[model samples]
Target: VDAFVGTWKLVDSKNFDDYMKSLGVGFATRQVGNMTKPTTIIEVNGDTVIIKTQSTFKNTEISFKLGVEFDETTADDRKVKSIVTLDGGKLVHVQKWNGQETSLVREMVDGKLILTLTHGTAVCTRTYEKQA
Candidate 1:
């Protein structure tokens, strides 16, 4: 019963330095990625979730489980694989693409939801509001 059946629009993003650093992205890439707005369209089926990340500059999709392992990648054409699951009330993503195991946490906040990516102590976050 994953809560993934909805369309979400990008409202804000934060921690550019942390996120990019975690991804091993360059300063210029971080700057550009921070300024970019990304949207997600999520469809859920039982414990499986399929998320479509969309934006004016890029588009990508991912499918994962609530407590199992899977693969994922970035939207900027950087293929970083990962595993996603549910921890408490948040969706947790553990990535292993590019020989890095980055952890990401996503949860609903206010009328929106926030996704935070972390690699060790470095972290980056992006927020989205529900859309029709």
Candidate 2:
């Protein structure tokens, strides 16, 4: 978990359009995500983790404890009560918000961080690389 802490630079994103469509994101929002290079700062302390996403376009921050449930909101987007857990070496977050439940799984592979976000049939993947 300690290795997961730090700021990472966004490298690539997949199925982002699908995830955006699931969230009812318009063309403008999609444009921002595609054009902006977002940076994520992940802070891991004990069993709790705080995530802060920033870019020249927008910024968002949220905190979640492992194996615990809490309310998380996505500004410039839509979401509600979300549950998160650390399974294996991956951080799994199943949000029971926005109609049904949305899940976002995060893991590190080959010196890169990958985030898989799912909302029903819409699934998105984003990868990040280490930054100085």
Candidate 3:
């Protein structure tokens, strides 16, 4: 079943520079993004879903029905087309801006939620701890 419907706090970050660079994140913005810890809140009611990533520096959120496309503005303020699909208790999120495309894949492993940020060939991994 989907185990991502809970509040989570970011615990660790791995290789964030290259990950944001791949996405063409701005200079000072990427620096701020790297140093921030965020709370991720995920919720679902039938086909509707909402995910909010809250941080001291910024807050980002998205809402959509499962397996459907929606417009999104990223943490870096990039407006893009987004879609999220459930995959074996995981959320496979893909976003596109013009010719650029990226995916943020998430799942639970060993009672932890791991967010895999994929910007084409570059990637970063973020781990989170759940709270009730």
Candidate 4:
């Protein structure tokens, strides 16, 4: 949890548009998302964690405990039940929506944030570098 306490800027991404498509995001929204990369700010305090995803179009913030389940609305306005947990050296977020499952994994590698996102059968990987 402490390892994830930092501000990270998206540097690279692969197949992210396809992953959003798998989540049934509208074409216009997906197109806009593909064009704009987002930054993430993670804050950890005691047993609570808050993650803020910031972008030019829209921003989202999620706060939860290590193993608590809560309702969440995704960037595309999809509602889901989400839970985040620590697995080894990674933070894993699992979401269930409309009978579909999605998982997001965040890890620190080479002092950079590596984010892996999976929606249905589509998978996307994004790398974020720490900001000063």
Best by TM-score: 4
Compute the lDDT of residue 66 as modeled in candidate 3.
72
What is the TM-score of each predicted model, taking all chains together? 0.78, 0.87, 0.87, 0.89
* Cα lDDT listed for each candidate: 0.70, 0.76, 0.78, 0.78
Candidate 2 structure quality by residue, lDDT tens digits, 1-132: 755788899988866665676576544577567547568888877768888887887778888888888875677455578788878898887878656777788899798888888777888777888784
What lDDT tens digits, residue by residue, belong to model 4 across residues 21-86?
666765457667765766788888789888787788777787878888888886664778887888
Residue 5 of model 4 has an lDDT of: 78
Candidate 4 structure, TM-score to reference: 0.89
lDDT of 1 by residue, 1-132 (tens): 334469888888778765665556645665766766566788786658877876666566777777776554455526666667676788887777665567768888577788886775676677878885
Query: Per model, how many backbone clashes are there?
Result: 1, 0, 0, 0
**Cα lDDT, model 1, residue 42:** 82
In model 3, what is the error at residue 61, expressed in angstroms? 1.9
Candidate no. 1 TM-score: 0.78
Alpha-carbon deviation at 66 in model 2, angstroms = 1.1
As for candidate 1, its clashing pairs are 81-97
All candidates: CA RMSD (Å): 2.6, 1.8, 1.8, 1.6
